[PDB]
Design a protein around this ligand. Sequence first.
Ligand SMILES: Nc1ncnc2c1ncn2[C@@H]1O[C@H](COP(=O)(O)OP(=O)(O)OP(=O)(O)O)[C@@H](O)[C@H]1O
Ligand SMILES: Nc1ncnc2c1ncn2[C@@H]1O[C@H](COP(=O)(O)OP(=O)(O)O)[C@@H](O)[C@H]1O
Ligand SMILES: [Mg+2]
Ligand SMILES: [Mg+2]
Lengths: 46, 50, 166, 523, 487
Amino acid sequence: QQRTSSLYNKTRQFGITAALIEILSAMSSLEGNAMKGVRRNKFWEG
Amino acid sequence: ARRVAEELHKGLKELADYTLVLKTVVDRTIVKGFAVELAGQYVNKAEGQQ
Amino acid sequence: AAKKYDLFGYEVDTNTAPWIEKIKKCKYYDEAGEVLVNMNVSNCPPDIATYNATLQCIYQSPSKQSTPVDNESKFCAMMDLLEEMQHRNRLKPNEESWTWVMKECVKSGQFRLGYCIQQVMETECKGCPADLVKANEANAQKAKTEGKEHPGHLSQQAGLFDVKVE
Amino acid sequence: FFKTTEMIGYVHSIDGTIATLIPAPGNPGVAYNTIIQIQVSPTTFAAGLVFNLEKDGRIGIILMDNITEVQSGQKVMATGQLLHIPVGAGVLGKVVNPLGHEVPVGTLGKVDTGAPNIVSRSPVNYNLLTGFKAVDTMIPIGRGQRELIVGDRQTGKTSIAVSTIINQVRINQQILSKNAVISIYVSIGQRCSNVARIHRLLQSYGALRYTTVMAATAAEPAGLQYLAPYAGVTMGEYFMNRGRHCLCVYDDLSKQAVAYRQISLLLRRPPGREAYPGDVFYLHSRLLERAAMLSPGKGGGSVTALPIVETLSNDVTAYIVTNVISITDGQIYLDTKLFTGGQRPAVNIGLSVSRVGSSAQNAAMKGVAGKLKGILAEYRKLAADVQTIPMIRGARFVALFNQKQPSYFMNAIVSLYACLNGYLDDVKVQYVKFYEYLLVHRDLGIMYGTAKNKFFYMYVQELNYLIRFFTLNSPILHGELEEMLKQHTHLFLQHYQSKMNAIKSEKDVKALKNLLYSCKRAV
Amino acid sequence: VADHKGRVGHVSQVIGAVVDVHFADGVPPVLTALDVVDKLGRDEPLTLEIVQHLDAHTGRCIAMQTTDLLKLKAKVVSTGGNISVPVGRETLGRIFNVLGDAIDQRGPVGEKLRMPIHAVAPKLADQAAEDAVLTTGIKVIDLILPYCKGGKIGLFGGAGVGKTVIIMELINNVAKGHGGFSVFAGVGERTREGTDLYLEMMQSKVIDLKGESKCVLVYGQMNEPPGARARVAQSALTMAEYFRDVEGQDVLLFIDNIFRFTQANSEVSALLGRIPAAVGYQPTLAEDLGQLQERITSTTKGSITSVQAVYVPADDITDPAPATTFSHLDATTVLDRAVAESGIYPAVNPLECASRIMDPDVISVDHYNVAQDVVQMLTKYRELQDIIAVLGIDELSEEDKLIVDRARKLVKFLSQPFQVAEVFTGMTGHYVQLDDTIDSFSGLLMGTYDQVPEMAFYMVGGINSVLEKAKKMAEEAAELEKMRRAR
Ligand SMILES: Nc1ncnc2c1ncn2[C@@H]1O[C@H](COP(=O)(O)OP(=O)(O)OP(=O)(O)O)[C@@H](O)[C@H]1O
Ligand SMILES: Nc1ncnc2c1ncn2[C@@H]1O[C@H](COP(=O)(O)OP(=O)(O)O)[C@@H](O)[C@H]1O
Ligand SMILES: [Mg+2]
Ligand SMILES: [Mg+2]
């Protein structure tokens, strides 16, 4: 029981971490593809 | 090169009224010969290192 | 005469006369299979006559192909064709097909397959032709007298530790 | 009268096995999913596949060959056509790439075709004999079926598929070429040495005459590994659309997924589960949907798929493994514990299933398999919880399922019938393989001069088709089959099992043990 | 910008199955269908559906066919509205696709009306209360989780547990004699299964080509791109809604598999610039499924008896997609792989199933009492199995041995051979009447059949079949005893 409980705790922590890392990796990939276009502002007026 | 460019120009119907202009670009990938590119039509008559 | 329909109800071409003529002009019986393939592709399923023509071509052809093919057997090809016809096409072989098989068995000297086909014809068909049965019996007697009834190695005495298990 | 190509831009960036192009202003432009040629030299080109068409005009390319020659700033020509590869009977017996280039050994088919329509198929009713008693009986496979081969590393996934390919050599040589089964062995991300060994093994048995190998080794770019299954099935679809039957083997889809994930990630595709691309299911889904059984109106040809998939520690809960399992019409699960326990092939009958069922079985095999399934189910139920008939015969059936090479249909069906009708009740479980070897490769009745059968003998290999036509439980063959089995059982018991049970000497015991082990690997 | 019919646009981006179109006069409304009029040397027409508006001029769309041979700046013309699908009795006996085009090669279809595949779900005031038991002829379903007419049913299960076979049995038992019409929607499944279903329906005269048919087939399968698998269900549901409203008929709706709709949406979500949710489904998993589910309902005009097959990835019933579908159903049938491996078919886990009409007010008092007693006995047997595993059957009390025996007989008596799985089983199927099931289980609970052998309840129908099998078992056992006696 002690060994299985330790494995259960370890597995849940790893699963949470892996899921969060996967989501953040997807978010970073989405952010990277985004490109900043030309700014249409009165640059001289400054 | 001029003859090839003119022949390609004749084939293209869209460029019938367009004037022909020749622009020279140096390519280090070819050692002998020449190539012509006009409106996407590319003719290769060159050779490289053996 | 009557239009035939496929599994989904689509009509299938029934004029299979030209294909039979093509089958009856082949040199090697493997080319007969090509004609059947062309028939199937052209939505012209073979009928009983086409299978009998193919069996005749198998019996009357010199070999399977222009170049020899190892372990080629006319009997196996015809039996496979009959299995296809009866099972995957729902067509009962007639007397002609079994007579062709029996003729092949007699011609090739296989007098045991001859007995099996003789029993088959006696059971399903209205008996086996007397000539074929007599020829098969003659082949069996010739094999028996010459001592080639069974392979020689099978008659060799063996033992628990005298058998070579490859 | 010039061979004018269609230049569409230049090579901008190179990141490993993928590249990005920049279109020259005022050019025709390239079409999606088409092939392009990168002019690495005035006379040499490197193939590539269009994958992305961005808003900026840049083009994502998947390099296919001559990657080392690709440099930034080189011209790119657009062919304007999808990928087509050579197809025909002239490719059999050769090793080729996904692009169709032949690999030296020591008609054009489109690679992006669609699967047959709903009304273009017919029910699976033609069996594809793998040669293994366990699979042929408990896991029927029919032509036009997708059967997954899932398991762990070093469990026989490749061996069973290669045996299935080899098992067709003997059949193809006898029956007409109309019903012959052609094989397309696709190696994906495997070692080059393994490909050579498999080629030599196929050549030894003469399977190259009916088989072609498509290889994308580990040293090749991911693009070729990603396209290998599609090119292989395309080569196999040539025979399907012409009234012929083919067998396609994918070894293995696990590595194709890795290659596709690499390509997608490098080309800035959003990662999904386990970093795989979102549309990773659709890849295999459209790959395996192209294997079907065409209706009689379209010729009646078929393609049979045997995709192979690897698991980790017998974990079938993985991502791609689940996707492939949810696509195929069945699965042969090879268990590691059974493999190490001496059961080979390690087919886990409990976890294996064929959704086609008995429809993909010959009339001769139908009754034997139907009774065998019930006997094995009862044996497993009782074993998990008294030598009853089900328990006496279940153990011998399990003993008969151990094989090293594919078995001829006549031998396998005869042995299964003998074990089914209690002819092996008096035979010890350890001696079942020796009994089967004597039955197949020997004739005790002829040896002892007690054989009165007229035609039914195990050395008459032509009886295989007669058995397949009429079945064993028919008046034509049943009487002689029973007589032969009775004579063989009596002679075997008397002249062999009495002596085998009387061995005590260490030399004789070792000799008998070696004999039994050899028999296990001989039949 | 009211009528956008014929509005011209140009393709601006192509990444996988997602395509961006630029309109100079303004992007048409979302869910609008677009046709790629440009001649690209394609063998099939290309149609796009607007799913998002990037700005006042650009719009992100999803293609219904493969985007091969698609170039940038390709001309696109709006169709003036959403995707339309033919409706009416002229669609009976035909096979359609996501776009509503006949694919059975059986000639043109005479369509008098077409309806968009996207519609607003019925409101609260349009809800009808129909509590009537639906007899499926299956002992387990009729007893533990009875189905209700005009309600929603779900067949949750993994891969290979028997979801498709149960659907085929339900068709054979309910659709052949159904008064109204039927609509089968194949979503992201095997094409060969569709062919088998079509052949079976033609043989069973449900689809009478020469006569009058009473069912419609709409197929979007695995080979199709994700765009078609996310709208084939909408097309089939639109046909069912028309039959419900305009025809005022009672219609059956079979969906297999409803999970593929979620899977297709998740596949396309990544390319739409949406951050994945937990597990890796799209963030709009709940709302997308809810909108479709709310349309599958019985209103005051007609009734739809919907049967949906739900796929549970890797048998993980806690997965978000299976977990989100439970609340949208009136009767859930949860299949278990462990039950199937034991030879029990259908592999229904009665301790995990539930029914809304499992109330004394809706069903008879005897039915409710028998079902509750069966469930309680099964739960008690599950509890006692652990003690048996540790101690052993011999260690249990007589009060517990009787419960164990009755529970084993109940477990084996729940199995039934289906008329559609004859090839799988090799035996003729049974159709058990509702009253027969109740009487048989009531008798078994109180011990009327304590002396019957346990195996007599395995793969049989009513109680009469049990007695016949027991008699056959006794006869064969007597024959075996006689054989032993002679020896
Ligand atoms: N039926 C069999 N009987 C005996 N040995 C076998 C059998 N099948 C396979 N083997 C042996 O088991 C080993 C593994 O077989 P195989 O190469 O087919 O496995 P695999 O599933 O392809 O594994 P991997 O490709 O990951 O190495 C080899 O040595 C092979 O010869
Ligand atoms: N009623 C049944 N009787 C026997 N076997 C069944 C039954 N239902 C399912 N099976 C088994 O499952 C297979 C069919 O699986 P299927 O219904 O397609 O499941 P799913 O769609 O959930 O994967 C059959 O070939 C058989 O092995
Ligand atoms: Mg391997
Ligand atoms: Mg299914």
